[model samples]
Target: LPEQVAPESRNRIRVRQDLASLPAELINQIGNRCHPKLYDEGDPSEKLELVTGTNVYITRAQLMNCHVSAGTRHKVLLRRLLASFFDRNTLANSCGTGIRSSTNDPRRKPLDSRVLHAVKYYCQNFAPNFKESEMNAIAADMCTNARRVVRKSWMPKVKVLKAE
Candidate 1:
């Protein structure tokens, strides 16, 4: 006899099936947040809205695509598309430091911490399906170029200060 599957596992399978059954238009919206041209020249606020709106969809697509059948890989292509999309956008956003409050001090922190915090927040809210290790892997991948830029820009200043 086939091994008995737990009811919770069956329910989870049913949920994934339901997600897969969603209309094509809904699924198509999944990774548009990272589209190269979606808000390429739009107002900053509008661009931010476009990016925020698709965050959840991207998460769902990533989760679903992880389990996609080999035959449907061509149709989904979430991993490949997201790789470039995230790399470009992260670099764009990393040029500036994070938000500041009027009462807070302006002491500088390492770029890696900022990148990791943002990644953790994104994974916690948007990509609940991701494990901690997976989130770290994705965060590291996203930060590869950004980290290099930060090191080039910030390390020299630190070295000068240390020499004082």
Candidate 2:
């Protein structure tokens, strides 16, 4: 006689079978879920909420709830999604010191409202996943890169003025 299977196991098996029948493209797209227009123009609060929501989804469950195979492609897609969120919410504003709106004055403020907001949002929402020191390190790196870019652009101008 055949052994009896639990109802939950039967249901799970059926669900997996159904998912396997779907196209790979559909599966791939479903695995890459994220908030729509999350990084587009929006208020700071809205942006923060969107970022929080994305993080919640990604962290609460594995990609596609572990229905799909854990392949390199899926891993890369997840990395890209995480990086996009990190870039839009944290890194973009952290380096605002590099850009000066005033042509008359070369000096720019080190930290602006946007940078402050980003830091606040990142710390409040992501502290459990990333320590405060890690965030600080990332911010410092961004500042260093921004300063390098600004220096590279300003040095040539200074050289030209000194020659003339």
Candidate 3:
């Protein structure tokens, strides 16, 4: 997120094309998308690893946290939609495979039938059109919009957070 533009210019024009293009509702939707951070064995490093592109373990926890028990239809729908967009087995295998590299011994649960069932249920029910490319675009747009919103709010709190 660092500024790559040259610093010599006295005047600069900036445009937030992504935020400008998003519908107000969608902007709100991404702004409000919150999740409690979960990590393997409650380790911050493990959580960071999960965040850095591995999908399986994180997706399982994410769907459970986001969708399980006593939520609105909209919440359920969004979680289901995200689940459809991400592949559980592929994500899981990548994490399991990646984490084993530096350890003397690594262990994991054999793929569970229940997890597969849950993933299938969501995929079949919601997000029939969740293509990988489309999901990437949505993810990028959401990040951009969220950053713009944060920057707007952050400007007022600059002194509090010690921003220059």
Candidate 4:
């Protein structure tokens, strides 16, 4: 048998009041749910009923390919982060479409906009020593290693589009 459902409420004032009076714990939980993670370890937008937390789907593929993670940790400043983010967003805009821009569909989706914005924000504001060219170069190197690691082999297989 189908479960009984409550009738829809058209009370906007009551809704707003309830929302304003929501508990702190509940709010924190909601924040956690909507809060984005740094990488694609899980998902940013997981829950429909509740905010599962915001996720920034930055990939090691995107990071390593940029000039950011090329040689030293010092190079991992904001400039590199921005460059990597720019590259990832470009990829998304080129290869992905519609919901692919928002959701992490593994095969189609690109990194989330929040992630890119954050990177750009940090790079422009925080990374005083970051160089765009260095970041790009390092990112490229990182991307190569990332692809290799994913396949668990140094050699590119027929399935890989291009190695190096």
Candidate 5:
């Protein structure tokens, strides 16, 4: 199979939400029992229960029902915590390297809008007291942490410590 031509960059669709995640050997096993549902949006449009059984799908906005409470650590590193699944490597199959007028590079999904939406929504509702600047910093920290995680390589025999 020749490498799939990168679909026009613009017209390309997210295959993660498709059946591509199914391995060639998987279909033969439980494919008969699987009911594939590609796109479905319910009341929240975030809490999705469409399909499963080794057939993963697209994750449109990564954070929909994310939990945040009083004890929530607002300054923790999101990238380190979410790297394996939240990084670009995993997202490559699903989303686009959309330019902001950006580039054809393998860039991770910007938690920009989704993360911000979640944080602000939290503040707007429960914490209803956050100043704009404080909320702004919290969201910025999310991106900053992810970028730092994106820069670090995860591996065995790891020995390192945070400096900044």
Candidate 6:
């Protein structure tokens, strides 16, 4: 997103030349793809997460006081997808596993060009009051977020949140 020179993390750009359907399924993903959460903690039918990223179609002002029904699903798919193309750093989970260079997990790759296109596409399809820079930042910020999700090694030394 910062460089935009990979010229496109455009989903499968992170998607890859052969797997170019991110945008396509993307169009459908909102209307068709995966959807669920089971994070339903309250009987009132609302919580923080989303039914789908499409909820971005709702206005923030509306969301400010407007609570959404958690409706029993929203499995952090966003976080998981971060592993898609940006997943090259795909490191093993434990720091004590061995030398990172010692062919530890056999799944890890050095790294890939940073990509925000996937998030970019997401914003294009969902963000209601979008701006290029805002969307760019979301994607860039998302890259780092996904990076940590893909590999615990990339995490901040400390997270302020009590949960982490």
TM values, all candidates: 0.25, 0.23, 0.21, 0.23, 0.25, 0.23
lDDT by residue (tens digit), candidate 1, 37-149: 22234321121211343342223333332323211232123233234234344433332233232245554323434434443444343344545565544433433332111
Local error of candidate 1 at residue 117 (angstroms):
1.7
Stretches of candidate 1 off by over 4 Å are 1-109, 141-164
lDDT of 3 by residue, 1-164 (tens): 11112224234433223211222333333333233232113322121112223333433333333332212333233333344333344434423211233245564434333333343333333344544344333322222222112222213422333356
lDDT of each: 0.33, 0.32, 0.32, 0.34, 0.31, 0.29
Best by lDDT: 4
lDDT of 6: 0.29
Report residue 146 deviation for candidate 5 (angstroms).
17
Candidate 2, residues 57-93: lDDT per residue as tens digits?
Answer: 2221222322232222332233323333344434443
Q: Write the per-residue lDDT of candidate 5 for residues 1-164, one digit (tens) a residue.
A: 11111214234333333322333322232334332221223222222222233222223222221211121332332222232133444333324222131347665444424433433443343334545566544433334523121222234443344697
Which of candidates 4 and 5 reaches a greater lDDT? 4
What's the true lDDT of residue 19 in model 6? 11
Q: Residue 86's C-alpha lDDT in candidate 4?
A: 50
How many clashes (backbone atoms < 3 Å, residues ≥3 apart in a chain or on different chains) does model 5 have? 2
The lDDT, on a scale of 0 to 1, for candidate 3 is: 0.32
Candidate 6 ranges beyond 4 A from true positions = 1-80, 90-115, 143-164
Q: Over all chains combined, what TM-score does candidate 2 have?
A: 0.23
Rank candidates, lDDT, best first: 4, 1, 2, 3, 5, 6
Candidate 5 residues lying further than 4 Å off, grouped into runs, are: 1-111, 143-164
- Which portions of model 3 show Cα errors greater than 4 Å? 1-106, 131-164
